[PDB]
Amino acid sequence: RCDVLVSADWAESNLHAPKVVFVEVDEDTSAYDRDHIAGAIKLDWRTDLQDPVKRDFVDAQQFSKLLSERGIANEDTVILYGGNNNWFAAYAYWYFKLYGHEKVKLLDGGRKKWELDGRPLSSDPVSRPVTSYTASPPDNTIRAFRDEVLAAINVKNLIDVRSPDEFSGKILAPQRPGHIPGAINVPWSRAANEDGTFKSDEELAKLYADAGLDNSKETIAYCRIGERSSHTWFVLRELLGHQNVKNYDGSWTEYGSLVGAPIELGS
């Protein structure tokens, strides 16, 4: 598990280790601007990682430019962590894998566990000398687009990670309500302990088996905009080792607005 996940003790021991860089990823940088893990830098999920105009996230060259400017190199081990339940740090992890970054890990429990453990935080500014990062083209075996999602109904597992009432169609969002036909509902938070850390392999395999994950089928996870489904994608692909898992980043805001798209109601 050390290949994709590191503990808070490991992280605290390796703050200033050679070729290791901590990256805080949240909705805003406002939490990071307050305080952060010593020497960590920041990526703004909204203004750094999304296209400013199109509904997408940055492409290869924009991702390369961003990392180059933040002083991240190809051969760095990247350690991702965040508040809001590590949701955005898992999303960035997914972006890092998409663009072919090999050494990257989630900090287990993210900011929540760091602060529960009472670990030190730095109020100091951080600058890293700019590097030359070069991303690989996207590995779309880990991403799903609308057309393949439509084609995956009754072919692949579809893990809806929204609230039980969004799934059944009782509530639209916080466009059409309901869920993708044949989807199973596993709210993202079932995969997580109170301290923010991921549950064990035993706990997770049972969670998804009970819910009806079919091991004869490949898998797609979805949310509203793919944020909490990143976190589920991480559990399924990186923790449990399922070899064929995609994040449908379009998710319900796209799917629920598609004309003519099949929708199913009820739990």
Side-chain angles (χ1 to χ4, degrees), residues 127-156:
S127 80
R128 274 179 84 82
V130 306
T131 43
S132 188
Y133 190 92
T134 295
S136 293
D139 168 11
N140 286 331
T141 69
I142 68 159
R143 179 171 196 201
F145 301 95
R146 57 180 178 266
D147 289 352
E148 77 194 289
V149 169
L150 289 162
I153 288 155
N154 297 311
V155 180
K156 294 185 173 186

PDB file of all heavy atoms in Angstrom, residues 127-156:
ATOM      1  N   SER A 127       8.308  29.019  -1.703  1.00  0.00           N
ATOM      2  CA  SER A 127       8.588  29.134  -3.120  1.00  0.00           C
ATOM      3  C   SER A 127       9.604  28.062  -3.472  1.00  0.00           C
ATOM      4  O   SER A 127      10.496  27.746  -2.678  1.00  0.00           O
ATOM      5  CB  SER A 127       9.123  30.532  -3.475  1.00  0.00           C
ATOM      6  OG  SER A 127      10.515  30.647  -3.172  1.00  0.00           O
ATOM      7  N   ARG A 128       9.438  27.482  -4.647  1.00  0.00           N
ATOM      8  CA  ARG A 128      10.310  26.441  -5.151  1.00  0.00           C
ATOM      9  C   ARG A 128      10.797  26.990  -6.468  1.00  0.00           C
ATOM     10  O   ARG A 128      10.046  27.615  -7.193  1.00  0.00           O
ATOM     11  CB  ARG A 128       9.544  25.150  -5.425  1.00  0.00           C
ATOM     12  CG  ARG A 128       9.386  24.240  -4.256  1.00  0.00           C
ATOM     13  CD  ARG A 128       8.569  22.982  -4.620  1.00  0.00           C
ATOM     14  NE  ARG A 128       9.401  21.937  -5.216  1.00  0.00           N
ATOM     15  CZ  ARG A 128      10.145  21.090  -4.505  1.00  0.00           C
ATOM     16  NH1 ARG A 128      10.146  21.151  -3.166  1.00  0.00           N
ATOM     17  NH2 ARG A 128      10.888  20.189  -5.124  1.00  0.00           N
ATOM     18  N   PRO A 129      12.063  26.774  -6.772  1.00  0.00           N
ATOM     19  CA  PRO A 129      12.529  27.260  -8.051  1.00  0.00           C
ATOM     20  C   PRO A 129      11.818  26.526  -9.190  1.00  0.00           C
ATOM     21  O   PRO A 129      11.640  25.307  -9.135  1.00  0.00           O
ATOM     22  CB  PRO A 129      14.018  26.927  -8.047  1.00  0.00           C
ATOM     23  CG  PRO A 129      14.308  26.200  -6.751  1.00  0.00           C
ATOM     24  CD  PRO A 129      13.061  26.005  -6.011  1.00  0.00           C
ATOM     25  N   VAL A 130      11.420  27.275 -10.207  1.00  0.00           N
ATOM     26  CA  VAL A 130      10.674  26.728 -11.327  1.00  0.00           C
ATOM     27  C   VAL A 130      11.479  25.621 -12.008  1.00  0.00           C
ATOM     28  O   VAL A 130      12.684  25.717 -12.110  1.00  0.00           O
ATOM     29  CB  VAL A 130      10.203  27.852 -12.319  1.00  0.00           C
ATOM     30  CG1 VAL A 130       9.419  28.926 -11.572  1.00  0.00           C
ATOM     31  CG2 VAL A 130      11.377  28.507 -13.066  1.00  0.00           C
ATOM     32  N   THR A 131      10.795  24.570 -12.444  1.00  0.00           N
ATOM     33  CA  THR A 131      11.401  23.419 -13.127  1.00  0.00           C
ATOM     34  C   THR A 131      10.891  23.314 -14.574  1.00  0.00           C
ATOM     35  O   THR A 131      10.079  24.136 -15.041  1.00  0.00           O
ATOM     36  CB  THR A 131      10.925  22.153 -12.439  1.00  0.00           C
ATOM     37  OG1 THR A 131       9.513  22.290 -12.173  1.00  0.00           O
ATOM     38  CG2 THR A 131      11.661  21.972 -11.100  1.00  0.00           C
ATOM     39  N   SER A 132      11.332  22.285 -15.279  1.00  0.00           N
ATOM     40  CA  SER A 132      10.719  21.925 -16.532  1.00  0.00           C
ATOM     41  C   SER A 132      10.018  20.582 -16.364  1.00  0.00           C
ATOM     42  O   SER A 132      10.682  19.549 -16.350  1.00  0.00           O
ATOM     43  CB  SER A 132      11.763  21.819 -17.641  1.00  0.00           C
ATOM     44  OG  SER A 132      11.105  21.654 -18.882  1.00  0.00           O
ATOM     45  N   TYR A 133       8.689  20.606 -16.224  1.00  0.00           N
ATOM     46  CA  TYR A 133       7.899  19.381 -16.112  1.00  0.00           C
ATOM     47  C   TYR A 133       7.362  19.068 -17.492  1.00  0.00           C
ATOM     48  O   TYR A 133       6.955  19.962 -18.201  1.00  0.00           O
ATOM     49  CB  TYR A 133       6.727  19.557 -15.126  1.00  0.00           C
ATOM     50  CG  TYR A 133       6.039  18.237 -14.798  1.00  0.00           C
ATOM     51  CD1 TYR A 133       6.439  17.483 -13.703  1.00  0.00           C
ATOM     52  CD2 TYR A 133       5.014  17.732 -15.601  1.00  0.00           C
ATOM     53  CE1 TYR A 133       5.850  16.255 -13.414  1.00  0.00           C
ATOM     54  CE2 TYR A 133       4.405  16.502 -15.312  1.00  0.00           C
ATOM     55  CZ  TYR A 133       4.830  15.782 -14.210  1.00  0.00           C
ATOM     56  OH  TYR A 133       4.275  14.574 -13.914  1.00  0.00           O
ATOM     57  N   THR A 134       7.337  17.808 -17.889  1.00  0.00           N
ATOM     58  CA  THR A 134       6.646  17.486 -19.128  1.00  0.00           C
ATOM     59  C   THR A 134       5.675  16.312 -18.961  1.00  0.00           C
ATOM     60  O   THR A 134       6.095  15.183 -18.743  1.00  0.00           O
ATOM     61  CB  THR A 134       7.645  17.278 -20.290  1.00  0.00           C
ATOM     62  OG1 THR A 134       8.319  18.532 -20.551  1.00  0.00           O
ATOM     63  CG2 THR A 134       6.897  16.814 -21.600  1.00  0.00           C
ATOM     64  N   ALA A 135       4.377  16.597 -19.048  1.00  0.00           N
ATOM     65  CA  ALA A 135       3.339  15.581 -18.820  1.00  0.00           C
ATOM     66  C   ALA A 135       3.292  14.639 -20.017  1.00  0.00           C
ATOM     67  O   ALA A 135       3.643  15.054 -21.111  1.00  0.00           O
ATOM     68  CB  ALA A 135       1.990  16.260 -18.650  1.00  0.00           C
ATOM     69  N   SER A 136       2.899  13.387 -19.791  1.00  0.00           N
ATOM     70  CA  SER A 136       2.561  12.432 -20.863  1.00  0.00           C
ATOM     71  C   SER A 136       1.122  12.733 -21.351  1.00  0.00           C
ATOM     72  O   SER A 136       0.312  13.289 -20.583  1.00  0.00           O
ATOM     73  CB  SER A 136       2.632  10.978 -20.342  1.00  0.00           C
ATOM     74  OG  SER A 136       3.973  10.550 -20.001  1.00  0.00           O
ATOM     75  N   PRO A 137       0.779  12.341 -22.605  1.00  0.00           N
ATOM     76  CA  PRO A 137      -0.617  12.529 -23.034  1.00  0.00           C
ATOM     77  C   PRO A 137      -1.560  11.706 -22.150  1.00  0.00           C
ATOM     78  O   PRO A 137      -1.131  10.718 -21.549  1.00  0.00           O
ATOM     79  CB  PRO A 137      -0.616  12.004 -24.481  1.00  0.00           C
ATOM     80  CG  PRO A 137       0.518  10.984 -24.498  1.00  0.00           C
ATOM     81  CD  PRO A 137       1.566  11.591 -23.617  1.00  0.00           C
ATOM     82  N   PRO A 138      -2.838  12.100 -22.071  1.00  0.00           N
ATOM     83  CA  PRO A 138      -3.719  11.437 -21.088  1.00  0.00           C
ATOM     84  C   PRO A 138      -3.940   9.911 -21.233  1.00  0.00           C
ATOM     85  O   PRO A 138      -4.127   9.376 -22.346  1.00  0.00           O
ATOM     86  CB  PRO A 138      -5.033  12.243 -21.170  1.00  0.00           C
ATOM     87  CG  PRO A 138      -4.971  12.977 -22.492  1.00  0.00           C
ATOM     88  CD  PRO A 138      -3.493  13.262 -22.711  1.00  0.00           C
ATOM     89  N   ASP A 139      -3.887   9.220 -20.103  1.00  0.00           N
ATOM     90  CA  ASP A 139      -4.127   7.799 -20.083  1.00  0.00           C
ATOM     91  C   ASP A 139      -5.597   7.680 -19.824  1.00  0.00           C
ATOM     92  O   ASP A 139      -6.040   7.649 -18.671  1.00  0.00           O
ATOM     93  CB  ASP A 139      -3.339   7.096 -18.979  1.00  0.00           C
ATOM     94  CG  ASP A 139      -3.798   5.665 -18.759  1.00  0.00           C
ATOM     95  OD1 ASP A 139      -4.570   5.150 -19.595  1.00  0.00           O
ATOM     96  OD2 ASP A 139      -3.394   5.046 -17.753  1.00  0.00           O
ATOM     97  N   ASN A 140      -6.346   7.616 -20.918  1.00  0.00           N
ATOM     98  CA  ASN A 140      -7.785   7.605 -20.870  1.00  0.00           C
ATOM     99  C   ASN A 140      -8.398   6.261 -20.500  1.00  0.00           C
ATOM    100  O   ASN A 140      -9.618   6.146 -20.445  1.00  0.00           O
ATOM    101  CB  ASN A 140      -8.380   8.179 -22.162  1.00  0.00           C
ATOM    102  CG  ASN A 140      -8.224   9.683 -22.230  1.00  0.00           C
ATOM    103  OD1 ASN A 140      -8.179  10.372 -21.195  1.00  0.00           O
ATOM    104  ND2 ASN A 140      -8.127  10.210 -23.441  1.00  0.00           N
ATOM    105  N   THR A 141      -7.563   5.266 -20.192  1.00  0.00           N
ATOM    106  CA  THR A 141      -8.077   4.080 -19.535  1.00  0.00           C
ATOM    107  C   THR A 141      -8.544   4.395 -18.114  1.00  0.00           C
ATOM    108  O   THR A 141      -9.123   3.533 -17.472  1.00  0.00           O
ATOM    109  CB  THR A 141      -7.046   2.904 -19.476  1.00  0.00           C
ATOM    110  OG1 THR A 141      -5.978   3.235 -18.575  1.00  0.00           O
ATOM    111  CG2 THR A 141      -6.483   2.520 -20.883  1.00  0.00           C
ATOM    112  N   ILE A 142      -8.276   5.591 -17.589  1.00  0.00           N
ATOM    113  CA  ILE A 142      -8.729   5.901 -16.209  1.00  0.00           C
ATOM    114  C   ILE A 142      -9.812   6.988 -16.115  1.00  0.00           C
ATOM    115  O   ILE A 142     -10.213   7.413 -15.012  1.00  0.00           O
ATOM    116  CB  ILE A 142      -7.538   6.187 -15.220  1.00  0.00           C
ATOM    117  CG1 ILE A 142      -6.819   7.502 -15.567  1.00  0.00           C
ATOM    118  CG2 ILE A 142      -6.593   4.998 -15.205  1.00  0.00           C
ATOM    119  CD1 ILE A 142      -6.031   8.122 -14.447  1.00  0.00           C
ATOM    120  N   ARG A 143     -10.299   7.391 -17.283  1.00  0.00           N
ATOM    121  CA  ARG A 143     -11.296   8.445 -17.444  1.00  0.00           C
ATOM    122  C   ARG A 143     -12.435   7.946 -18.342  1.00  0.00           C
ATOM    123  O   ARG A 143     -12.211   7.248 -19.342  1.00  0.00           O
ATOM    124  CB  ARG A 143     -10.643   9.679 -18.110  1.00  0.00           C
ATOM    125  CG  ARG A 143     -11.609  10.881 -18.376  1.00  0.00           C
ATOM    126  CD  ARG A 143     -10.851  12.131 -18.824  1.00  0.00           C
ATOM    127  NE  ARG A 143     -11.697  13.303 -18.689  1.00  0.00           N
ATOM    128  CZ  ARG A 143     -11.507  14.452 -19.332  1.00  0.00           C
ATOM    129  NH1 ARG A 143     -10.467  14.607 -20.138  1.00  0.00           N
ATOM    130  NH2 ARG A 143     -12.345  15.453 -19.140  1.00  0.00           N
ATOM    131  N   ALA A 144     -13.656   8.303 -17.991  1.00  0.00           N
ATOM    132  CA  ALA A 144     -14.763   7.979 -18.879  1.00  0.00           C
ATOM    133  C   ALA A 144     -15.434   9.271 -19.352  1.00  0.00           C
ATOM    134  O   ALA A 144     -15.606  10.221 -18.560  1.00  0.00           O
ATOM    135  CB  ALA A 144     -15.757   7.086 -18.172  1.00  0.00           C
ATOM    136  N   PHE A 145     -15.810   9.287 -20.626  1.00  0.00           N
ATOM    137  CA  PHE A 145     -16.625  10.372 -21.223  1.00  0.00           C
ATOM    138  C   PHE A 145     -18.094   9.932 -21.409  1.00  0.00           C
ATOM    139  O   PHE A 145     -18.389   8.734 -21.413  1.00  0.00           O
ATOM    140  CB  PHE A 145     -16.035  10.775 -22.589  1.00  0.00           C
ATOM    141  CG  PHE A 145     -14.608  11.252 -22.515  1.00  0.00           C
ATOM    142  CD1 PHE A 145     -13.554  10.373 -22.753  1.00  0.00           C
ATOM    143  CD2 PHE A 145     -14.316  12.590 -22.203  1.00  0.00           C
ATOM    144  CE1 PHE A 145     -12.209  10.820 -22.689  1.00  0.00           C
ATOM    145  CE2 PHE A 145     -12.982  13.056 -22.138  1.00  0.00           C
ATOM    146  CZ  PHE A 145     -11.927  12.174 -22.383  1.00  0.00           C
ATOM    147  N   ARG A 146     -19.002  10.891 -21.566  1.00  0.00           N
ATOM    148  CA  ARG A 146     -20.436  10.593 -21.732  1.00  0.00           C
ATOM    149  C   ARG A 146     -20.780   9.413 -22.677  1.00  0.00           C
ATOM    150  O   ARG A 146     -21.569   8.542 -22.309  1.00  0.00           O
ATOM    151  CB  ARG A 146     -21.198  11.846 -22.158  1.00  0.00           C
ATOM    152  CG  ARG A 146     -20.678  12.498 -23.448  1.00  0.00           C
ATOM    153  CD  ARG A 146     -21.484  13.740 -23.815  1.00  0.00           C
ATOM    154  NE  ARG A 146     -20.962  14.395 -25.021  1.00  0.00           N
ATOM    155  CZ  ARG A 146     -20.075  15.397 -25.015  1.00  0.00           C
ATOM    156  NH1 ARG A 146     -19.588  15.876 -23.866  1.00  0.00           N
ATOM    157  NH2 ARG A 146     -19.659  15.904 -26.161  1.00  0.00           N
ATOM    158  N   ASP A 147     -20.202   9.377 -23.880  1.00  0.00           N
ATOM    159  CA  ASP A 147     -20.597   8.343 -24.842  1.00  0.00           C
ATOM    160  C   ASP A 147     -20.314   6.928 -24.323  1.00  0.00           C
ATOM    161  O   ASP A 147     -21.190   6.065 -24.400  1.00  0.00           O
ATOM    162  CB  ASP A 147     -19.993   8.561 -26.244  1.00  0.00           C
ATOM    163  CG  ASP A 147     -20.622   9.784 -27.010  1.00  0.00           C
ATOM    164  OD1 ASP A 147     -21.630  10.424 -26.587  1.00  0.00           O
ATOM    165  OD2 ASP A 147     -20.057  10.129 -28.055  1.00  0.00           O
ATOM    166  N   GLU A 148     -19.113   6.690 -23.777  1.00  0.00           N
ATOM    167  CA  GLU A 148     -18.817   5.363 -23.222  1.00  0.00           C
ATOM    168  C   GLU A 148     -19.645   5.022 -21.962  1.00  0.00           C
ATOM    169  O   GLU A 148     -19.878   3.854 -21.681  1.00  0.00           O
ATOM    170  CB  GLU A 148     -17.306   5.145 -22.992  1.00  0.00           C
ATOM    171  CG  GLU A 148     -16.737   5.826 -21.769  1.00  0.00           C
ATOM    172  CD  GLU A 148     -15.219   5.863 -21.800  1.00  0.00           C
ATOM    173  OE1 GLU A 148     -14.581   4.803 -21.634  1.00  0.00           O
ATOM    174  OE2 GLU A 148     -14.647   6.949 -21.976  1.00  0.00           O
ATOM    175  N   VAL A 149     -20.078   6.046 -21.225  1.00  0.00           N
ATOM    176  CA  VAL A 149     -20.877   5.855 -20.030  1.00  0.00           C
ATOM    177  C   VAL A 149     -22.262   5.329 -20.425  1.00  0.00           C
ATOM    178  O   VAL A 149     -22.759   4.357 -19.838  1.00  0.00           O
ATOM    179  CB  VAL A 149     -20.966   7.152 -19.192  1.00  0.00           C
ATOM    180  CG1 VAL A 149     -22.001   7.046 -18.116  1.00  0.00           C
ATOM    181  CG2 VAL A 149     -19.630   7.453 -18.543  1.00  0.00           C
ATOM    182  N   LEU A 150     -22.859   5.969 -21.434  1.00  0.00           N
ATOM    183  CA  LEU A 150     -24.066   5.486 -22.051  1.00  0.00           C
ATOM    184  C   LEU A 150     -23.897   4.050 -22.548  1.00  0.00           C
ATOM    185  O   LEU A 150     -24.786   3.232 -22.371  1.00  0.00           O
ATOM    186  CB  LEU A 150     -24.481   6.407 -23.217  1.00  0.00           C
ATOM    187  CG  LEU A 150     -25.024   7.792 -22.832  1.00  0.00           C
ATOM    188  CD1 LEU A 150     -24.983   8.766 -24.041  1.00  0.00           C
ATOM    189  CD2 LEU A 150     -26.456   7.712 -22.177  1.00  0.00           C
ATOM    190  N   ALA A 151     -22.765   3.743 -23.168  1.00  0.00           N
ATOM    191  CA  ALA A 151     -22.553   2.415 -23.723  1.00  0.00           C
ATOM    192  C   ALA A 151     -22.255   1.374 -22.627  1.00  0.00           C
ATOM    193  O   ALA A 151     -22.325   0.164 -22.888  1.00  0.00           O
ATOM    194  CB  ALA A 151     -21.431   2.438 -24.810  1.00  0.00           C
ATOM    195  N   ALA A 152     -21.935   1.834 -21.412  1.00  0.00           N
ATOM    196  CA  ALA A 152     -21.588   0.924 -20.298  1.00  0.00           C
ATOM    197  C   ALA A 152     -22.778   0.446 -19.435  1.00  0.00           C
ATOM    198  O   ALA A 152     -22.582  -0.361 -18.536  1.00  0.00           O
ATOM    199  CB  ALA A 152     -20.510   1.560 -19.394  1.00  0.00           C
ATOM    200  N   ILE A 153     -23.982   0.976 -19.686  1.00  0.00           N
ATOM    201  CA  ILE A 153     -25.184   0.577 -18.958  1.00  0.00           C
ATOM    202  C   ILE A 153     -25.396  -0.924 -19.146  1.00  0.00           C
ATOM    203  O   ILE A 153     -25.464  -1.398 -20.273  1.00  0.00           O
ATOM    204  CB  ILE A 153     -26.428   1.381 -19.442  1.00  0.00           C
ATOM    205  CG1 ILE A 153     -26.349   2.835 -18.962  1.00  0.00           C
ATOM    206  CG2 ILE A 153     -27.739   0.772 -18.935  1.00  0.00           C
ATOM    207  CD1 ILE A 153     -27.116   3.784 -19.807  1.00  0.00           C
ATOM    208  N   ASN A 154     -25.465  -1.661 -18.029  1.00  0.00           N
ATOM    209  CA  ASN A 154     -25.613  -3.129 -18.028  1.00  0.00           C
ATOM    210  C   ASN A 154     -24.378  -3.885 -18.568  1.00  0.00           C
ATOM    211  O   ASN A 154     -24.385  -5.112 -18.669  1.00  0.00           O
ATOM    212  CB  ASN A 154     -26.888  -3.570 -18.756  1.00  0.00           C
ATOM    213  CG  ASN A 154     -28.151  -3.064 -18.079  1.00  0.00           C
ATOM    214  OD1 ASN A 154     -28.322  -3.208 -16.863  1.00  0.00           O
ATOM    215  ND2 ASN A 154     -29.041  -2.453 -18.863  1.00  0.00           N
ATOM    216  N   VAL A 155     -23.315  -3.144 -18.885  1.00  0.00           N
ATOM    217  CA  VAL A 155     -22.061  -3.756 -19.289  1.00  0.00           C
ATOM    218  C   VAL A 155     -20.999  -3.655 -18.187  1.00  0.00           C
ATOM    219  O   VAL A 155     -20.290  -4.643 -17.920  1.00  0.00           O
ATOM    220  CB  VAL A 155     -21.536  -3.193 -20.649  1.00  0.00           C
ATOM    221  CG1 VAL A 155     -20.198  -3.876 -21.046  1.00  0.00           C
ATOM    222  CG2 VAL A 155     -22.631  -3.322 -21.777  1.00  0.00           C
ATOM    223  N   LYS A 156     -20.893  -2.482 -17.554  1.00  0.00           N
ATOM    224  CA  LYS A 156     -19.900  -2.261 -16.491  1.00  0.00           C
ATOM    225  C   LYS A 156     -20.564  -1.924 -15.156  1.00  0.00           C
ATOM    226  O   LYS A 156     -21.704  -1.490 -15.143  1.00  0.00           O
ATOM    227  CB  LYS A 156     -18.950  -1.126 -16.869  1.00  0.00           C
ATOM    228  CG  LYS A 156     -18.053  -1.406 -18.056  1.00  0.00           C
ATOM    229  CD  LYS A 156     -17.037  -0.225 -18.251  1.00  0.00           C
ATOM    230  CE  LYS A 156     -16.036  -0.559 -19.322  1.00  0.00           C
ATOM    231  NZ  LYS A 156     -14.966   0.453 -19.469  1.00  0.00           N
TER     232      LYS A 156
END
